[PDB]
Amino acid sequence: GRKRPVPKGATYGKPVHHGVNQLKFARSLQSVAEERAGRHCGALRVLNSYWVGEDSTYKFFEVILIDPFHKAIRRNPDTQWITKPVHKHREMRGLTSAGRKSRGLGKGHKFHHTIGGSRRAAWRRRNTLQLHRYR
Amino acid sequence: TKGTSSFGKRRNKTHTLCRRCGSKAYHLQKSTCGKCGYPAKRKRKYNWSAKAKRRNTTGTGRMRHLKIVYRRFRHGFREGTTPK
Amino acid sequence: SSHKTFRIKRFLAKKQKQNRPIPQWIRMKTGNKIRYNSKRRHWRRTKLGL
Amino acid sequence: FIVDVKANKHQIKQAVKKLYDIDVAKVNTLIRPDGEKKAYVRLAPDYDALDVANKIGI
Amino acid sequence: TWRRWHRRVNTTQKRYAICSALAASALPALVMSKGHRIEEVPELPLVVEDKV
Amino acid sequence: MKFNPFVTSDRSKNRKRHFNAPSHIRRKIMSSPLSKELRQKYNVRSMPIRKDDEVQVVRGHYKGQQIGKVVQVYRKKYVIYIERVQREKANGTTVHVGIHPSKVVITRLKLDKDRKKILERKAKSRQ
Amino acid sequence: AKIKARDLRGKKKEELLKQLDDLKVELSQLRVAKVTGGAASKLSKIRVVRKSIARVLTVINQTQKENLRKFYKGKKYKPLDLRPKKTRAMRRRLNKHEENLKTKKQQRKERLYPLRKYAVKA
Amino acid sequence: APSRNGMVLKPHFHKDWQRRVATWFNQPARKIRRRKARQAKARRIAPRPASGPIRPIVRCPTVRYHTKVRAGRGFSLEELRVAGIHKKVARTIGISVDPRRRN
RNA sequence: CGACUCUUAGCGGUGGAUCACUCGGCUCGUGCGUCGAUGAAGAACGCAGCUAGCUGCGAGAAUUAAUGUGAAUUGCAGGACACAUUGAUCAUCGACACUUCGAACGCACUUGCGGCCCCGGGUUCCUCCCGGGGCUACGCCUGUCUGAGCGUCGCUU
RNA sequence: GAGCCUUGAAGCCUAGGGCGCGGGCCCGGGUGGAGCCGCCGCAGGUGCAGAUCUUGGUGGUAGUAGCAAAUAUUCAAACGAGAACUUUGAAGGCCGAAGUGGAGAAGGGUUCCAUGUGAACAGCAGUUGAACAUGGGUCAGUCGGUCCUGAGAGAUGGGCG
RNA sequence: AGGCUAAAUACCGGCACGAGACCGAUAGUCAACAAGUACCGUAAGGGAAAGUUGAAAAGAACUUUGAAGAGAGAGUUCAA
RNA sequence: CGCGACCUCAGAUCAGACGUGGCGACCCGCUGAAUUUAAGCAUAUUAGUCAGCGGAGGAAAAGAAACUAACCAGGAUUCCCUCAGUAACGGCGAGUGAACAGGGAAGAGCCCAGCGCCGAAUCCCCGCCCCGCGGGGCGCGGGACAUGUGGCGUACGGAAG
Numbered sequence A: 001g002r003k004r005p006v007p008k009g010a011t012y013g014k015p016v017h018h019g020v021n022q023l024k025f026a027r028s029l030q031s032v033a034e035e036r037a038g039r040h041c042g043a044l045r046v047l048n049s050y051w052v053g054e055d056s057t058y059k060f061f062e063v064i065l066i067d068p069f070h071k072a073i074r075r076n077p078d079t080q081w082i083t084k085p086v087h088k089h090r091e092m093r094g095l096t097s098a099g100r101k102s103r104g105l106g107k108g109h110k111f112h113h114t115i116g117g118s119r120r121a122a123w124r125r126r127n128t129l130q131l132h133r134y135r
Numbered sequence B: 001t002k003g004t005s006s007f008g009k010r011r012n013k014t015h016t017l018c019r020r021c022g023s024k025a026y027h028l029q030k031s032t033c034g035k036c037g038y039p040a041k042r043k044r045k046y047n048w049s050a051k052a053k054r055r056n057t058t059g060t061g062r063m064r065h066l067k068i069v070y071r072r073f074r075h076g077f078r079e080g081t082t083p084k
Numbered sequence C: 001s002s003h004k005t006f007r008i009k010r011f012l013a014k015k016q017k018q019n020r021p022i023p024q025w026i027r028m029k030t031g032n033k034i035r036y037n038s039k040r041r042h043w044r045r046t047k048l049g050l
Numbered sequence D: 001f002i003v004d005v006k007a008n009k010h011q012i013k014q015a016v017k018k019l020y021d022i023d024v025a026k027v028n029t030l031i032r033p034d035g036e037k038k039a040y041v042r043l044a045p046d047y048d049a050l051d052v053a054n055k056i057g058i
Numbered sequence E: 001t002w003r004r005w006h007r008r009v010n011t012t013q014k015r016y017a018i019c020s021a022l023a024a025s026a027l028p029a030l031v032m033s034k035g036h037r038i039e040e041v042p043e044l045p046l047v048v049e050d051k052v
Numbered sequence F: 001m002k003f004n005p006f007v008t009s010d011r012s013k014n015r016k017r018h019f020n021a022p023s024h025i026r027r028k029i030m031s032s033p034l035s036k037e038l039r040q041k042y043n044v045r046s047m048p049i050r051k052d053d054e055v056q057v058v059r060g061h062y063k064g065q066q067i068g069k070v071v072q073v074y075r076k077k078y079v080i081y082i083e084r085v086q087r088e089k090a091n092g093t094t095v096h097v098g099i100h101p102s103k104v105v106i107t108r109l110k111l112d113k114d115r116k117k118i119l120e121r122k123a124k125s126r127q
Numbered sequence G: 001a002k003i004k005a006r007d008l009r010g011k012k013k014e015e016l017l018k019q020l021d022d023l024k025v026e027l028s029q030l031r032v033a034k035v036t037g038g039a040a041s042k043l044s045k046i047r048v049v050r051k052s053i054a055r056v057l058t059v060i061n062q063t064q065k066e067n068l069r070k071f072y073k074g075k076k077y078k079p080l081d082l083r084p085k086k087t088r089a090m091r092r093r094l095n096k097h098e099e100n101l102k103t104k105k106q107q108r109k110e111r112l113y114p115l116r117k118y119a120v121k122a
Numbered sequence H: 001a002p003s004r005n006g007m008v009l010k011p012h013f014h015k016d017w018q019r020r021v022a023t024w025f026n027q028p029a030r031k032i033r034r035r036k037a038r039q040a041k042a043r044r045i046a047p048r049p050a051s052g053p054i055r056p057i058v059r060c061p062t063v064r065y066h067t068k069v070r071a072g073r074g075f076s077l078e079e080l081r082v083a084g085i086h087k088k089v090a091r092t093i094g095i096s097v098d099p100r101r102r103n
Numbered sequence I: 001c002g003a004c005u006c007u008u009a010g011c012g013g014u015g016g017a018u019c020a021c022u023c024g025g026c027u028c029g030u031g032c033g034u035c036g037a038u039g040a041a042g043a044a045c046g047c048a049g050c051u052a053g054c055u056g057c058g059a060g061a062a063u064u065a066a067u068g069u070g071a072a073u074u075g076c077a078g079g080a081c082a083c084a085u086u087g088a089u090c091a092u093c094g095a096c097a098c099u100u101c102g103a104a105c106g107c108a109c110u111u112g113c114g115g116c117c118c119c120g121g122g123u124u125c126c127u128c129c130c131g132g133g134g135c136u137a138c139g140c141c142u143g144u145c146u147g148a149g150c151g152u153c154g155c156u157u
Numbered sequence J: 001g002a003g004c005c006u007u008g009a010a011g012c013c014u015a016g017g018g019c020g021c022g023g024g025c026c027c028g029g030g031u032g033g034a035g036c037c038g039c040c041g042c043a044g045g046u047g048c049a050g051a052u053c054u055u056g057g058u059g060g061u062a063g064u065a066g067c068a069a070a071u072a073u074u075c076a077a078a079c080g081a082g083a084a085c086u087u088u089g090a091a092g093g094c095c096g097a098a099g100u101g102g103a104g105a106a107g108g109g110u111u112c113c114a115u116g117u118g119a120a121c122a123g124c125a126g127u128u129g130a131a132c133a134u135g136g137g138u139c140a141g142u143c144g145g146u147c148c149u150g151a152g153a154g155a156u157g158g159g160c161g
Numbered sequence K: 001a002g003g004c005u006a007a008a009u010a011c012c013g014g015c016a017c018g019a020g021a022c023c024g025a026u027a028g029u030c031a032a033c034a035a036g037u038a039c040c041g042u043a044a045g046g047g048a049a050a051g052u053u054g055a056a057a058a059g060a061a062c063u064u065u066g067a068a069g070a071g072a073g074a075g076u077u078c079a080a
Numbered sequence L: 001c002g003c004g005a006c007c008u009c010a011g012a013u014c015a016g017a018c019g020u021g022g023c024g025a026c027c028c029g030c031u032g033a034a035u036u037u038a039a040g041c042a043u044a045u046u047a048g049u050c051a052g053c054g055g056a057g058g059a060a061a062a063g064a065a066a067c068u069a070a071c072c073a074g075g076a077u078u079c080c081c082u083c084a085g086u087a088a089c090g091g092c093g094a095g096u097g098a099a100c101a102g103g104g105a106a107g108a109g110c111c112c113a114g115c116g117c118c119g120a121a122u123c124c125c126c127g128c129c130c131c132g133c134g135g136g137g138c139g140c141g142g143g144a145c146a147u148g149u150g151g152c153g154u155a156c157g158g159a160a161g
């Protein structure tokens, strides 16, 4: 898990938040690997990634990247969806498999917190104080 | 000897005119800017100061390319020139 | 300071270009209400500071 | 003469020799504080500065 | 901006007001007291032909 | 009544476009009516005025029977100046009086091929 | 005397260069006349001289650009100033052919099962 | 703070609701937009009828609404096979097809 | 009797309140979806005949070319006044041009110091010789060129 | 309201006439020059004597305090309408080489120089100035930066995030 | 435990746009005006004041006192 | 010892191409307090917000069920009215707080890995010819990727011979 970057473990708040040692970071390490790979190479497009190794400390992933300007990918129209500019940097918006699995969406009674789109859109639609002309 | 006798010793300017936004903020002793952050690749902007965005965002200078981007978008980026 | 870099002399050269009053024909123009240069900098009261 | 600031002694010397058809002994440049360059172009002793000034019209 | 601007009326009261206005348009004293010049005008509510 | 929703009835917007219209719009603004015999002869209501048009003034301090030729058209001031219409200063120097071209009845136009094309378009559009 | 663009566009570059050199000689002589005092009828003239220099330079650059395009037209990998300019998103448009390019399964599916036109009242 | 005999009130206004106030000032605007959308569809798309695909007779799952009836989604592939037509051929005819609906 | 002080009224004097006006804001709604490595936003400097600011431009610098309209811009002298040649201003702008810093990109930046290729004159040629033109930032993709291994193997000495 | 009017609306003043108990109002007289009011309903950012109220302006104080740190000025002439102060002659003094002298670094940016004006600035004054307006002025192989490292700051390889 | 997909939805940034039971230069955006300007702080940053002659300058020719500032006559304008 | 093939790699100012940065009102991902309330204050509320960081588009996200329900069963995502200030959470204090129906706008569905079958029938690049305007895209001859697996036939609604 991650350690809180506050100096000397001091939070300066209520006793809710003094747990500097344990913040357990809602994104997965697979999503961290996707972020680091795509941000080191923003010219590529992060498709997916998978686990290949662990010992104690270092967790090892292999990431597949798509080149949106090679001619074999600009042709073959089962692949042209990732060439479109709405798929730029999927790894940092949370559009891959590990990204969706870290966002925690899906159909069910176990996912009413993010009922549609995202949890912030669900918060928006549930705390919109809606007002009309005729009341 | 705290005030007017100590104002006379102020002689060496720490801030000098930077070269990206030009606002006298390039701190020479630290080799960085105080307003835009010149050795950083990105402009130093924040949300706690709305007036800094009001000074520094687009619409306050030339927009010498961006206005003619509007002027070409008004017709649709033509390539042919004219009839006779 | 009597010796300084080239950008400071560019800045001081533009300020010497600025330091001149309104000519007598712009006030004589049509639809004008500019009567004196309000951006007139004097070298004692206002210091430009590089 | 008054010269643009992007020129040097050699370009001023070549410009004078290729425009006014006269030889140049030396060129001393300063930056005039309005923003231009003041160039003192001393000519060869074979030429006459008064005659060159009358031919260029100053 | 969220002042309560627009006010809903019952549709029965809307139709009631329409019927009351159309009934009060038939009496000559009410329309002359509103100020329309009905001196030389013929009979109340005027019905013109289908060629109009 | 105004029906097209892409034109203003706003007083501020109309005065803004009027006092900041460019010169090719100000030529259309500074249009002048014609005399009754000339509009009978040409079948046109009004024409934009130019440098060499003869002018009878109908309203103002100078009124009627003063057919003169204009000299200057300040489109910045919306003012034509007439050669016959004079006013002395204090020091005996004459100067032309400011006359707006909407209070101007043109008695003689200037003949030009471009104005013949304009007049033909006016007559064809008036029909 | 006047300098017309249709007069400039018909001449060769060896005459345009000499006429430009003559315009710049007149430019320098009227700069000398501007510095000295009694040449007050030459300042609108130096205005129209520098506008004429701009016109001649424009005609020369137009001629050079169209002369470059006459043999860079139809060539693969044309240079960057001759490539289209429009905007970056319109550079990252695929193609009309790459947009209309469809896979064989979807093409055969549209061959077999096309959309129908109909009406349902009786 | 409380008073005489009135109902205990707990309004949910402690959160900063003033930023997120969505007031329907564009409700006739959306009405005109959606009128023009339906009219532009009926003009440009087809002589197909508005609300094009046909919907099934469907009973509502409840002990409350199951006495009533509803226009469903699709025609429940076993039903479509008994009617005897292909799936996408039915979709191009105008039959709405849902592969999930059982019988 | 005059001088000083107080209260009204008339007139006069910094003062700009009230009233009247608006090329201004504020709110709402609709239409479109638009930056950049082919150099973005921003900044510095410069440009008018008389030109400090704003506005407009980039050594072609108060705009160039083309189209449309059709005799002006204007405070002043001048300039094209021509239109049975091409035509001033204005708007559109679709063609050219767009100094320097700036993601800024040869290095950090003191406008300093270089390194290749080509062209002109300077002892007609490199040898740290002047001017001009092109290139020279990081990461990465596909393909080409070169070589590193006691990584694995084939054939032979 | 076939309301009021450039034959004078709003606004403002008034030792004028009046009404209502009062909130206030109507008319007359004087400036002003383009909009205003009455009734019935409707909606308010709708009435000020205060809040060490906010902004702006003005009195008593008041022609009052104050123009007093560093020994000191005086006569004649001149340009000038105008001189305790500007310039020159002369006299007497001070700073007295650790200077009230001659030039520099940082800092200022045209203040340096000439000509002209003296409403504005200089706490009085000017014919004077660092004020104003116009025009000038900074020339380098051999003076310094540029070259070098010092304390230190720093990117790539690498690591962290 | 792999992936795409238009529609209804949102928009206080931007390009034009139309309306207002809104405000009227101490109000309304800080800014109707050479406004993020003058100016202040080393810097982050803070941040103003400031609309109106006339229908057209026709902005007072000329005489006179003073060196001028200013003034008395005279004149333009319905009106100084 | 030398030559060659494959696999791991390094170099270049190799040919072609790509990301940086800005605006950020709407949208996505992370993490992220306290003033305030609870009349005190720790749990709670403020708030999964303010600030901070990273991204793209005119929309974004989501989107074809490892779903809802438990009866005469429905059937992608989104948006509105209801559900509902309800079930429920809470020093069960202050307060917080959904969902399934149901009615409407919108309607569009699909593809791939595996399984086998097709002698890789597939894609990238280079050179010349066939070509029309304002310009780049099909067909001929050899250089690579790919058998550690291109493309067609296939998608849980069954599919193939």
Ligand SMILES: [Mg+2]
Pocket: A135
């Ligand atoms: Mg109610």
Ligand SMILES: [Mg+2]
Pocket: B001
């Ligand atoms: Mg002491």
Ligand SMILES: [Mg+2]
Pocket: none
């Ligand atoms: Mg750098």
Ligand SMILES: [Mg+2]
Pocket: C047, C048, C049
């Ligand atoms: Mg300062």
Ligand SMILES: [Mg+2]
Pocket: F010, F012, F013
């Ligand atoms: Mg308006």
Ligand SMILES: [Mg+2]
Pocket: none
């Ligand atoms: Mg009580």
Ligand SMILES: [Mg+2]
Pocket: H014, H015, H016
């Ligand atoms: Mg709060």
Ligand SMILES: [Mg+2]
Pocket: none
């Ligand atoms: Mg005031």
Ligand SMILES: [Mg+2]
Pocket: I065
């Ligand atoms: Mg032209």
Ligand SMILES: [Mg+2]
Pocket: I133
């Ligand atoms: Mg070169």
Ligand SMILES: [Mg+2]
Pocket: none
């Ligand atoms: Mg009343």
Ligand SMILES: [Mg+2]
Pocket: J045
């Ligand atoms: Mg109030």
Ligand SMILES: [Mg+2]
Pocket: J045
């Ligand atoms: Mg109000």
Ligand SMILES: [Mg+2]
Pocket: none
């Ligand atoms: Mg008061």
Ligand SMILES: [Mg+2]
Pocket: J049, J050
């Ligand atoms: Mg009171």
Ligand SMILES: [Mg+2]
Pocket: J052
């Ligand atoms: Mg007080």
